[PDB]
Design an enzyme around this catalytic site. Structure first.
Site, PDB file in Angstrom:
ATOM      1  N   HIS A   1       0.834  -1.162   0.000  1.00 32.84           N
ATOM      2  CA  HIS A   1       0.000   0.000   0.000  1.00 32.84           C
ATOM      3  C   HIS A   1       0.919   1.281   0.000  1.00 32.84           C
ATOM      4  CE1 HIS A   1      -2.594   3.189   1.401  1.00 32.84           C
ATOM      5  NE2 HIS A   1      -3.614   2.442   1.013  1.00 32.84           N
TER       6      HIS A   1
ATOM      7  N   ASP B   1       0.955   4.337   1.241  1.00 33.33           N
ATOM      8  CA  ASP B   1       1.192   4.904   2.559  1.00 33.33           C
ATOM      9  C   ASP B   1       2.129   4.018   3.393  1.00 33.33           C
ATOM     10  OD1 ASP B   1      -0.501   7.227   2.100  1.00 33.33           O
ATOM     11  OD2 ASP B   1      -2.231   6.185   2.950  1.00 33.33           O
ATOM     12  N   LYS B   2       1.937   2.692   3.362  1.00 33.13           N
ATOM     13  CA  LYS B   2       2.841   1.794   4.123  1.00 33.13           C
ATOM     14  C   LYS B   2       4.207   1.606   3.511  1.00 33.13           C
ATOM     15  CE  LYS B   2       1.778   0.854   7.741  1.00 33.13           C
ATOM     16  NZ  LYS B   2       2.186   1.701   8.847  1.00 33.13           N
TER      17      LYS B   2
ATOM     18  N   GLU C   1      10.483  11.914   6.487  1.00 36.60           N
ATOM     19  CA  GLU C   1       9.199  11.714   5.826  1.00 36.60           C
ATOM     20  C   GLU C   1       9.440  11.238   4.399  1.00 36.60           C
ATOM     21  OE1 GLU C   1       7.124  12.077   7.973  1.00 36.60           O
ATOM     22  OE2 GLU C   1       7.462  13.897   9.146  1.00 36.60           O
TER      23      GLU C   1
ATOM     24  N   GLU D   1      14.821  16.090   8.493  1.00 39.99           N
ATOM     25  CA  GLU D   1      15.999  16.569   9.194  1.00 39.99           C
ATOM     26  C   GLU D   1      16.630  15.422   9.943  1.00 39.99           C
TER      27      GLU D   1
ATOM     28  N   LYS E   1      -5.415  -4.756   1.153  1.00 39.42           N
ATOM     29  CA  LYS E   1      -6.252  -4.033   2.117  1.00 39.42           C
ATOM     30  C   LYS E   1      -7.237  -5.039   2.680  1.00 39.42           C
ATOM     31  CE  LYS E   1      -7.480   0.489   2.132  1.00 39.42           C
ATOM     32  NZ  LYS E   1      -7.704   1.756   1.376  1.00 39.42           N
TER      33      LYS E   1
ATOM     34  N   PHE F   1      -6.989  -6.617  -9.945  1.00 40.31           N
ATOM     35  CA  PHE F   1      -6.149  -5.711  -9.158  1.00 40.31           C
ATOM     36  C   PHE F   1      -4.734  -6.123  -9.548  1.00 40.31           C
ATOM     37  CE2 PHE F   1      -5.447  -4.406  -4.351  1.00 40.31           C
ATOM     38  CZ  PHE F   1      -4.537  -3.429  -4.736  1.00 40.31           C
TER      39      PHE F   1
ATOM     40  N   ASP G   1      -1.216   6.574  -7.868  1.00 38.91           N
ATOM     41  CA  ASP G   1      -1.616   6.714  -6.485  1.00 38.91           C
ATOM     42  C   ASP G   1      -0.522   7.466  -5.741  1.00 38.91           C
ATOM     43  OD1 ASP G   1      -3.229   6.481  -4.236  1.00 38.91           O
ATOM     44  OD2 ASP G   1      -3.397   4.308  -4.378  1.00 38.91           O
ATOM     45  N   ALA G   2      -0.865   8.186  -4.693  1.00 36.83           N
ATOM     46  CA  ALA G   2       0.153   8.930  -3.947  1.00 36.83           C
ATOM     47  C   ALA G   2       0.044   8.453  -2.529  1.00 36.83           C
ATOM     48  CB  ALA G   2      -0.086  10.431  -4.041  1.00 36.83           C
TER      49      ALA G   2
ATOM     50  N   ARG H   1       0.265   8.323   7.326  1.00 36.52           N
ATOM     51  CA  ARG H   1      -1.109   8.461   6.922  1.00 36.52           C
ATOM     52  C   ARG H   1      -1.911   7.219   7.294  1.00 36.52           C
ATOM     53  NH1 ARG H   1      -2.536  12.711   3.296  1.00 36.52           N
ATOM     54  NH2 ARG H   1      -4.484  11.546   3.276  1.00 36.52           N
ATOM     55  N   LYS H   2      -1.365   6.302   8.100  1.00 34.00           N
ATOM     56  CA  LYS H   2      -2.092   5.095   8.498  1.00 34.00           C
ATOM     57  C   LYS H   2      -1.996   4.924  10.029  1.00 34.00           C
ATOM     58  CE  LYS H   2      -4.063   3.546   4.771  1.00 34.00           C
ATOM     59  NZ  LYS H   2      -4.345   4.969   4.520  1.00 34.00           N
TER      60      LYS H   2
ATOM     61  N   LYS I   1      11.061   8.304  13.000  1.00 33.04           N
ATOM     62  CA  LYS I   1      11.329   9.128  14.202  1.00 33.04           C
ATOM     63  C   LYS I   1      12.132   8.376  15.239  1.00 33.04           C
ATOM     64  CE  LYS I   1       7.341  12.086  13.862  1.00 33.04           C
ATOM     65  NZ  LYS I   1       5.897  12.097  14.138  1.00 33.04           N
TER      66      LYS I   1
ATOM     67  N   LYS J   1      11.483  11.866  19.758  1.00 40.44           N
ATOM     68  CA  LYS J   1      10.149  12.212  19.253  1.00 40.44           C
ATOM     69  C   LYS J   1       9.147  11.426  20.027  1.00 40.44           C
ATOM     70  CE  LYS J   1      12.533  14.162  16.010  1.00 40.44           C
ATOM     71  NZ  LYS J   1      13.975  14.005  15.758  1.00 40.44           N
TER      72      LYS J   1
ATOM     73  N   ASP K   1       6.126  11.483  20.060  1.00 44.48           N
ATOM     74  CA  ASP K   1       5.033  10.907  19.263  1.00 44.48           C
ATOM     75  C   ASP K   1       5.152   9.381  19.219  1.00 44.48           C
ATOM     76  OD1 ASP K   1       3.386  13.189  18.481  1.00 44.48           O
ATOM     77  OD2 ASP K   1       4.589  13.472  16.636  1.00 44.48           O
TER      78      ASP K   1
END
EC number: 2.5.1.6
Lengths: 370, 371, 371, 370
Positions: free
Chosen positions: A14, A16-17, A42, A55, A156, A225, A233-234, A239-240, A260, A264, A266
């Site tokens: 996918h 995003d992954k 990123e 960075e 998915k 598929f 696709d972007a 984003r997941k 990260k 971080k 997060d």
């Protein structure tokens, strides 16, 4: 009262992954040479392109082209027929890299973070998200070992479970619906794919007690598929975040994990909050719990800690908090040592969920004193 | 009985929010010319670069140079001294646009859930933690733009911790426990002067006095120096502030970002519908606090399932509230789009200060309920 | 008396030429819709990327996805096995387009020189070294596309060394001394089979037999293996094959690339005019070989100065030839544009196989001279 | 017969020359750590962006962000008022970097190359291109030392000279026209700029004997020029190859020099051909000469060598060739040793011409034996 709940998971291919896994491959490459590397990497994936932006403060010398291409090869994109090829895709790098009592290190950013745990499974995770992840992991196992060689990397899954409630706990009763879409080579028919999805994937992963006559299966629901991944696709790192955590259950603070380092919060404080929640549930202090923590940039101590037990303890939420504060020190400079967060193990967290595995330090409960 | 809860928010110049605003500016540009445009626009911002990626089906012809640059100008990044300048930044367009289907020219998605949430603890009908966090960023932008604090730059983050008590499932804010503010600033101003203006002209202009006391903790410019900010200091991407966009950690989130996605993305339009339902129940006096969970099944336009969780704050059972919701709302995604006027270009206004809580959008206008 | 001279050429799939072809495809797309478009389009090609940069003033709305991808398709890069695929490559658009001037909507450049050159040693009126080099690449593309050598890929380079003698300033080709051919190929074919087909089906189909002999040196696939090619193996940019585009080292070059520049760039349209003049003198029987040097002064439309250098190959003095040129040609850049029909979209055809020597363009059609 | 000739030069801030200088800064950074580095680095500059693309085989660890930014600072772009700022511009890197008798090394590519020399100046270069370069170099000197602090980095000069011919030689008689445009700060008037260009630049560089009453001066001919460099402009490596060599004189093979190590005969053989031409002219074997050489990829020896003397020798062109073949070995593996081409001196060649300086090894004539 009863309700349905649905969680999603996505395979390594996918878009995003892909980005999450590349971000963590870059982090891991830094950590292998420099345990104290600071990384905020990123990744962006689209038709024919991986871009890295962010960075880094590190003494490492990392070959980004090789790290990225290899991760893409590892995911399984090696040909334009699949939509993407590690050998010929564009890799663009915009990483700005500088050179540089550790228990007192300040948070790398402000933010809030949650941990959650629930006694409904051995993994101490919601059944919906355990099953969703397990279906994607099994697809990738069978793809990579050649059991189902027609399988490709993008997938998915969505799993709907019917629950009952029991004094604030949740009791899964049955799987209501399973949806699986998986990328595939041109040379297989849908009837064969559907049968393999049911027999080699669903039956190998979902306990039989949850499957019954009325379980709805949507296997390859949108038909063929063949092309997948970033083609037309972007995708982006982070984003997941719901898929990476509790699949809709509990709560989320908004921070992404991949790319990260430990400063971080997060990532490090979400791992530590999970560790706290799991420790409380495996300790028998409650059946289900949500933990919140928060930080300010440049400040080492949490600004707030909160415990919500859903009414599933004999202790008050105040008493659980006092117990948490006696057994855990949630400074990032301490969390790093307890959870071994300088080790280059992050690429493994980037697919199939960061929580509910056995090998990660945040998944081994601490024995509590109270 | 008391507990703490924390939420954050970020300013228009935070790099993730720059990206959300740009992606929604792109969507609005397309909708302006073609109300049926399909858009899935991602933005990446880093030192000197705005990159647009994603897929569009549209009849519009949009000038991305103009759309991106005006948005950055409006945010306030107009000089290299501030770390980013709309006049000189690199705008890279990687979007893939196609015309709508030739043959339809001449003539309901994923299995998933969405949540709505509402609480009577504020008039916005939103958690106080996040209402206050948003307002602190908005006040910084106001004082920056009218020149009261000309040393302010666009990049800001805030965080608010409130001490609450509970009452039959409702939450009652007692006081503000902790406030964090970090805001980018010019080279000349001193830390003392900044910390004093943030307390006196920002916080005390925004937070009701009854919530502030002598024990309230202030972390104002806690890193000490914040000259480097915007995309210079941290890479931004679309859809990375999804909790700032929604309920601040309260309620629940089933996954999905909003910005740069048109109304046919159900995780954008059904989230707004579920907010609308939750807010309507609370303003209707049917409960004090509510989580509305809407499940969709692959294909079926009608929701698979709706659960209402009122935390104990309602005289009616959760099955009675569910019956009211069904009698008053049609949550088919095409009906939602018509009822909430979602084809109009209003999305750029959603992309800073939260999608929920402002009295500017159709999903924030409660429906009068019959029962 | 004899000497060697060498020139090279490259195929459509050489990465620099891919870029020239794309930049001219962009120009043609604009001119198709707006004949007054101003274009300065640069292309960069590297592993999996086509980047378009530069400035455009135009009323056109061009679909760059389509223009770039069709051009790459036409070149032959359609699979990752070949190192580049038009279906999956990254097209990044960084072009800056503005509308033409608002007020003119409702209603001659640098001090520089340009050269033209022509020689009677071939019918193309071009050096044999470069005519042959171009034809070898063209023959490889022909045999690749009609499937005679299906192991061929688009990336090729050739180089031809000719032994010449002189005769009162004219040059007389005696024989081909050395031929180099390097061409990208599939994984299966063997070096022996390639080297044999290049000699027998390419070189002997292109070079007149009278120029080939038993001492001719062949360097065919001299590196030994050329599977990796196109933008995968070497970064391409627009305007890096300027000598391949012109006279192969013969004559002279005053500086400037051609591709991606519209007709108002005088170093593109006055170079074509100077070719036209040089070819007209040679075909008019006024000399055997000629270098035409045209100087422009900042502002003045009329050329500052014209010198004619005939190397001794003319019965008339260089001042008499200059008088003929002035009586027959008006080299003001606006008059050139009208006489050579330069507003038409024919530029993509110029961007491989040389701008000079083919009988496809107005500047290659001689003017009948009065004197 | 008499004729006019015009050459151009551009300053360091011209977008094409920015790219040349960045390319060579990257090459120099590799060579400082790994003398045997193979580099093909192309640079693209446009509004707000430097992009690097190409291939490198090197053991060096180079920080590309720092090398690029520093070169941009060195050129003098530090503020958006100038059109470009090293601190905030976008740097994107797409360099694919692998790890790895030297006299037998094959040419890195096929190609043809020319060298040229002429007795009309001491530098053994055409007067038009010597003067054009010297005007830009003097602008940069006065800018950087604060003599004319209003000056900015972008500039373009054109110099037209009237020549006579003498038995195939060329004799410069007078400067016909000088054009100078230079970027400048908002805070100076055109009357002051024009006067400084004439008095501190033209008179300090052009011998007075070439300047007379009828010399035409076009100083800041297009008026104000506050913003320059890559802003609303696109530049590329290797787009100023005539400016980098003989300014229209002699001939060119088409290869760019900047960003290329010695195995790229586009650069090393052009340097060696210049060295040959200069050696012949300073040897008194002729007054003006053009040298051609050519190579095939993977082949160490030249495929052709040719000498054209314009009729300015008493020896035949055949005799000059035989002399050249006795005194020079133009294999790249030998040229490297004679001209010291592994030294990181290339950033200095990237502006103001590669030829006609004293410090470069290809500008020191070899004593010939014949």
């Amino acid at each position: 009262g009863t309700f349905l709940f649905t969680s999603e998971s996505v395979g390594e291919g996918h878009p995003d992954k892909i980005c999450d896994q590349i971000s963590d491959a870059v982090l891991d490459a830094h950590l292998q040479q420099d345990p104290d590397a600071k990384v905020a990497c990123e990744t962006v994936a689209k038709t024919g392109m991986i871009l890295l932006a962010g960075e880094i403060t590190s003494r490492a010398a990392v070959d980004y082209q090789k790290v990225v291409r290899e991760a893409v090869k590892h995911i399984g994109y090696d040909d334009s027929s699949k939509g993407f090829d590690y050998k010929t895709c564009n890799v663009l790098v915009a990483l700005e890299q500088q050179s540089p009592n550790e228990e007192d290190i300040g948070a790398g950013d402000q933010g809030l973070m949650f941990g959650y745990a629930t006694d409904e499974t051995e993994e101490c995770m919601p059944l919906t998200i355990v099953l969703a992840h397990k279906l994607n992991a099994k697809l990738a196992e069978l793809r990579r070992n050649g059991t189902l060689p027609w399988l490709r990397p993008d997938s998915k899954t969505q799993v709907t479970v019917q629950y009952m409630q029991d004094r604030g706990a949740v009791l899964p009763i049955r799987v209501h619906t399973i949806v699986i879409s998986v990328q595939h080579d041109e040379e297989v028919c849908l009837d064969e794919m559907r049968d393999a999805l049911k027999e080699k994937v669903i039956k190998a992963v979902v306990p039989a007690k949850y499957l019954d006559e009325d379980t709805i299966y949507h296997l390859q629901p949108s038909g063929r598929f063949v092309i997948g991944g970033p083609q037309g696709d972007a995708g982006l790192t982070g984003r997941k975040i719901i898929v990476d955590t509790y699949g809709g259950w509990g709560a989320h603070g908004g921070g992404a994990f991949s790319g990260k380092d430990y400063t971080k919060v997060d990532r490090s404080a979400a791992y530590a909050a999970r560790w706290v929640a799991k420790s409380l549930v495996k300790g028998g202090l409650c059946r289900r719990v949500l933990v919140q923590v928060s930080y300010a940039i440049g400040v080492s101590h949490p600004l707030s800690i909160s415990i919500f037990h859903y009414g599933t303890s004999q202790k008050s939420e105040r008493e659980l908090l006092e117990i948490v504060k006696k057994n855990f020190d949630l400074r990032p400079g301490v969390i790093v040592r307890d959870l071994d967060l300088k080790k280059p193990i992050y690429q493994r967290t980037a697919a199939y969920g960061h929580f509910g595995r056995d090998s990660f330090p945040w998944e081994v409960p601490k024995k509590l004193k109270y």
